[PDB]
């Protein structure tokens, strides 16, 4: 199969932090990954350290 990729347009927009002295997120949070971002493997070349937890479930 030969199928083109889907658009990188997403609803809602981009994270906005409310102006003023509240510190509240008008939309989304600080961990949001934009669609136009490199791979996780590209961004984290080292990978998990030797002292990280293999299973992340709490």
């Amino acid at each position: 199969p030969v199928v083109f990729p889907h658009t990188r347009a997403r609803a809602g927009g981009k994270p906005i932090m409310m102006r003023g002295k509240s510190g509240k997120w008008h939309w989304l949070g600080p961990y949001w990954k934009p669609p136009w971002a490199p791979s996780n493997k590209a961004r984290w070349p080292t990978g998990p350290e030797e002292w990280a937890w293999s299973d992340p479930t709490r």
Partner: protein, 129 residues
């Protein structure tokens, strides 16, 4: 049409052996015309992408300029005696789409058929729209 206007960018690369462009049957036909005119060394079809192996001469590339005529938001058509005037005194390649296929402006002029002007390759500074 959008894919061809995109492939213009991939064709206008410099200091590159080969460059990739989006795939489309219209792109394949235009590439066939370009190779028959000896403007590219070759090309390869790989799924969603086409890899164009470009041709150079004395450092500079063979393709020195691309002028887009027919955009997806505006068609451009010409009668034979308008195509003759518009391509007057020019060694460039004006790609034409007709009922007989994607051909050169010289084939279109000899056939005397009405065509849609897509691109102009190495046409210097010669355009009207």
């Amino acid at each position: 049409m959008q894919r061809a206007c995109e492939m213009v960018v991939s064709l206008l690369r410099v200091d590159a052996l080969s460059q990739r462009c989006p795939f489309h049957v219209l792109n394949v036909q235009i590439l066939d015309l370009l190779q028959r005119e000896g403007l590219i060394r070759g090309f390869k079809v790989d799924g969603t992408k086409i890899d164009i192996l470009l041709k150079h001469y004395k450092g500079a590339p063979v393709i020195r300029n691309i002028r887009v005529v027919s955009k997806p938001s505006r068609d451009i058509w010409l009668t034979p005696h308008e195509l003759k005037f518009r391509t007057r005194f020019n060694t460039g390649l004006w790609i034409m789409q007709t009922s007989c296929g994607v051909i050169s402006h010289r084939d279109c002029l000899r056939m005397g058929i009405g065509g849609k002007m897509l691109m102009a390759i190495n046409n210097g500074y010669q355009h009207f729209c």
